[PDB]
Structure 1
Amino acid sequence: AKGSTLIVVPFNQGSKQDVEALIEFIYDTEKNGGLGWDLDAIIPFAAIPEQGIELEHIDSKSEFAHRIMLTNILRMMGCVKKQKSARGIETRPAQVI
């Protein structure tokens, strides 16, 4: 619709360096090659399937999937907190779904 913008980016939620970099890029000013944005919502729906992995089969894939689906969602929320705190933004919270 009018006023809408879509920004497609390559991203690996597995990587913490990508998580830091993504939020740094969103919050950076246009001068420094960012978007100059300030998130009103985050929808961290990224996930990888794990089929037929019972307890005894939990290995590298499962520990990685866990990093995507928990650890780096906490890191991504932490990042957005640190970016908003940096700029004294106290009245525009981001809705995490």
Structure 2
Amino acid sequence: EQGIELEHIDSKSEFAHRIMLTNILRMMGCVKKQKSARGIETRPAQVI
């Protein structure tokens, strides 16, 4: 994202925010759901 100030926040900015925050959180939630469904408590995934 270049040259997108507060007044320029638009579809591209919202999509980038989705990629970089919301879908990351969804991905960790999905890994959590898979591990819980398989009953895994002692093998955590390290989210860097």
**2:20 paired with 1:69:** yes
Q: CA deviation at 1:69?
A: 0.3
Equivalent position of 1:85 in the other structure? 36
Q: Percent identity?
A: 100
Task: Please identify runs of 4+ aligned residues in structure 1 that moved more than 2 A.
Answer: none
The structure in which a higher percent of residues are strand is: 1
Number of aligned pairs?
48
**2:16 paired with 1:60:** no
Q: CA deviation at 1:61?
A: 0.1
- Provide the secondary structure at the position in 1 that maps to 2:21: helix
Q: CA deviation at 1:78?
A: 0.1
Give the TM-score taking structure 2 as reference length: 0.99
Gaps of 5+ in 1: 1-49
Distance 1:80 1:96 in 2: 10
Give the TM-score taking structure 1 as reference length: 0.49
- Provide the secondary structure at the position in 1 that maps to 2:12: helix
Gaps of 5+ in 2: none
Q: CA deviation at 1:80?
A: 0.2
The structure in which a higher percent of residues are helix is: 2
